[PDB]
Design a protein around this nucleic acid. Sequence first.
DNA 1: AAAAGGCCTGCAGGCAAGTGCACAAACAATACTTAAATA
Lengths: 328, 171, 544
Amino acid sequence: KSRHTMSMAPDVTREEFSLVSNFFNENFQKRPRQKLFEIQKKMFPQYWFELTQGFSLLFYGVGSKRNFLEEFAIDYLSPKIAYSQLVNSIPCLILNGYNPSCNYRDVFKEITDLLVPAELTRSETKYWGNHVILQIQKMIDFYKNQPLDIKLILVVHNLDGPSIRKNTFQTMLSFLSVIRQIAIVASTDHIYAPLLWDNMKAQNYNFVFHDISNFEPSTVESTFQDVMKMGAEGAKYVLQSLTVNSKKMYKLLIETQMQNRGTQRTGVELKLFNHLCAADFIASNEIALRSMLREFIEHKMANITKMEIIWVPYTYAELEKLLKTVLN
Amino acid sequence: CISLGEPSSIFQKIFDSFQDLNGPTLQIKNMQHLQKFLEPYHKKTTFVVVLDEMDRLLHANTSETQSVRTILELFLLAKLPTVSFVLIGMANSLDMKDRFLSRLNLDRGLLPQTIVFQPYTAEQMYEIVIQKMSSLPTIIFQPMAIKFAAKKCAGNTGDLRKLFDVLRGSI
Amino acid sequence: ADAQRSHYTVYPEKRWELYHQLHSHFHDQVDHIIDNIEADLKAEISDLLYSETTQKRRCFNTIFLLGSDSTTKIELKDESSRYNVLIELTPKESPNVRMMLRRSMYKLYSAADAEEHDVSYDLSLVENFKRLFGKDLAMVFNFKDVDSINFNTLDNFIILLKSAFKYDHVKISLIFNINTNLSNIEKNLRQSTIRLLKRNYHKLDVSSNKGFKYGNQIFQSFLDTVDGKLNLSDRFVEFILSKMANNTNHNLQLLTKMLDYSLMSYFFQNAFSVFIDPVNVDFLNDDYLKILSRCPTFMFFVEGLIKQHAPADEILSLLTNKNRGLEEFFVEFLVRENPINGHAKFVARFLEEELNITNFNLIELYHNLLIGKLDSYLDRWSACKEYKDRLHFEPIDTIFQELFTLDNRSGLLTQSIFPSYKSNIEDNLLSWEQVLPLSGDLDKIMAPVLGQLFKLYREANMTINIYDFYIAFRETLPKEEILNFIRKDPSNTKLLELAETPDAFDKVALILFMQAIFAFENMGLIKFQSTKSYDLVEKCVWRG
DNA sequence: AAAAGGCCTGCAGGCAAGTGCACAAACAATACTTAAATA
């Protein structure tokens, strides 16, 4: 069952990786991106007239919205529609949904002061008995008899974020979006977005959908997430900071384990390994040997199975690289 | 930075250098409040900050929640006056640089000069020993046996001063 | 740069006026019926809450809300000399019994304080209550959303409350907001506690959808709001009916939503809105005269003229050869009253009070009307046989209506309100050209990374290897173009030094792959099965 | 040519390799409460 394992892959340093991603994502399909963008910008007065009726504007379509999200919102919608009201441009409440440190409690503590503090509603602040939901209920009862104009524009990047998608946060944002004097516009990436809202939450949201596909590299979103590249190279820096005796003993280990990708058959037995590290007069006994070995083990820098095989799971290529570069 | 596990009371410890009294609770807590907190007052002699034993803040509570968060906050030097709090940090285990955000570390921060100080067998530490021991007692003993001790310890050792102490115990 | 911080805020037409003056009438009647139903619900619940003097007076009376949305606010009688404290419990507020008790006690004590102007959060507060507040107490519990609360906990809590009936200065009442299925509730509780609730219950219903007494009524009000001023094809009505039938709980809200959205589409693209009233016949333009030519009514009636009027001279003269005469020929049929709406209201109110029929839908009735199957509609009850000739209405084929109407033939609204969320993505990803138009060479000779990876994606089985796909994608990767494109940037130093790496092809392959599989996890297509392992993955979506 | 003693082979008798994984408990630090210092 010999499967292609990602171990047998040409690794790329973080610098080369970052820089080539930069080159590509900033030059791969520029002319397509700008053509698409200048074409779709004509839709902006359409969004104006749609949000005139407070229809929560949800945005789907492949590629990141974050850039385009802040682009449409901060630059076009807010100040133009502010001028259109008849003065601080309506504070654009951007929700870094990709940021997993967003919490309903604090963001609502912000929202409160953003919204009208016409009365000392802080007096209604109580025990953990959630005054988020009760106070927003009261705020809705208030706004039901208030004039109709946007007093704040909130926009969520990646409404399917690891925090906003929490059903509590979702319900809070639903009961929020019920308010008329606020404009709700957001976007997601999860293809299963409609799984989030029942007819109750839809009724709260009154979602109107729009596709936006511009095929972005998801710059910011690549930042919070992480994959195996984001071990062999882990130990590569460790061995760069050690003692000469450790250097020599690992040198002997790597010779006797690379002689026979560095496979397990190619290792050595601890019997003969002690025989060697005692012949060349390095190890006095087995206890000091295993001690000066566990410093590699206590950071998972070498493998051991059973013969008493100590086999370096690091590739033959990377191993002989250690030899030719950092060991010799 | 030992008994804190949090990035507030640290910077009061830098306010300790003013020999004054203020309300620090915020101005020592959030990065922006820190930037507000560090515009010099007396003569415009630049003040730079140093964090001794960050390997407790680095080794603090859960990584992706507070300690990596604290590192991101304190570590970003995006001030507008170039006379900023230039962190002079110290970490025991290298994994700290592996725990950093990949994007942030390569193009920004105090990270690049990841100077290493590998265990000095005799060549620098033994000479520090000799230079402090300029007033050398008459019969200390055979210096070659001294270097023998140095090597056969530093094999598994990083304290020649403590090997010197077991030598004073021997004498 | 800073964007990685958490939600850091930033602190930076005649057609339209008719939209206003009519859309606002629409919403006005909407909100009228809305407040009607709301006051109705408040009234019925406040009524049923009292006057039920049950001589037992040792068991709190229970009020079930069948089909309750759980959002229905409640009011109480002021009822001096006795506090009327409302208590609301959410399935979030209910981790156990003890914390339910404490949260409820704190809530009711705070309310007694607000009415009142050291206390144990427990049942003692009940009996001390009089001594500590004077007036006797009467609380009511409003379990906001019961179906999700763990019924063992709620049961234990009710048995707890039962003990409060040994003080006689308090009385309690329960308000169950069941989402539906009273059988579901009576399936979970201990039967011995049901027999405690069953002392005096009332299966009061709260459903916006019931006999359409609000549904059909708001539909009719909408018909009135659109009377004589536009039309709506059978396609529109059947689409409304369909999309309504699949949304059980809240038909009305969605109905208003779709109607308003259709109106917005019209008043933002239709140019003839200004021509439902004669006061803007002078609002005509020569280009408007041109666009009033391409009408389907226009061509149909030109054909009818050519057929019937054998002399082509009258038809030719009334044609583009004249413009004032032509526009008069057009405005001739502009005033078709369309009794369809009138006779619709007629038959509606008729079978509402003459036949007095309730379990019916005026929407599909109007559909049949525009069709003419209204006979095979009214037949459903066998009571209009004597009336199917006085409620008779053959559908009339009005003319020129193809300019003053609304129909979903372009599916703009349907695609924008009810999109194929996964199908749209699969299409625009695999196809990608209908949206995407120095370095243009590779874009023209090699697909965007997303779609050209999606297409290999497609042939993948349930469980796939990371690296097998990596190589099958390396096959797709043109190394010749990869060196064409990397060295195509000489201006950068480090990128140039990168460009001469001899093993750069597979390296950049892994780079692009580990960016693509990266950005295709938050998009939901692929799942990184067994994080900390990531040796294989699964393709969640399939085309289908 | 078929029906009755006898003997040969297709179905599976079976179960360890073995991974998934659905159970559990502290878990790391949430969210909030309550006494104190200053005007």
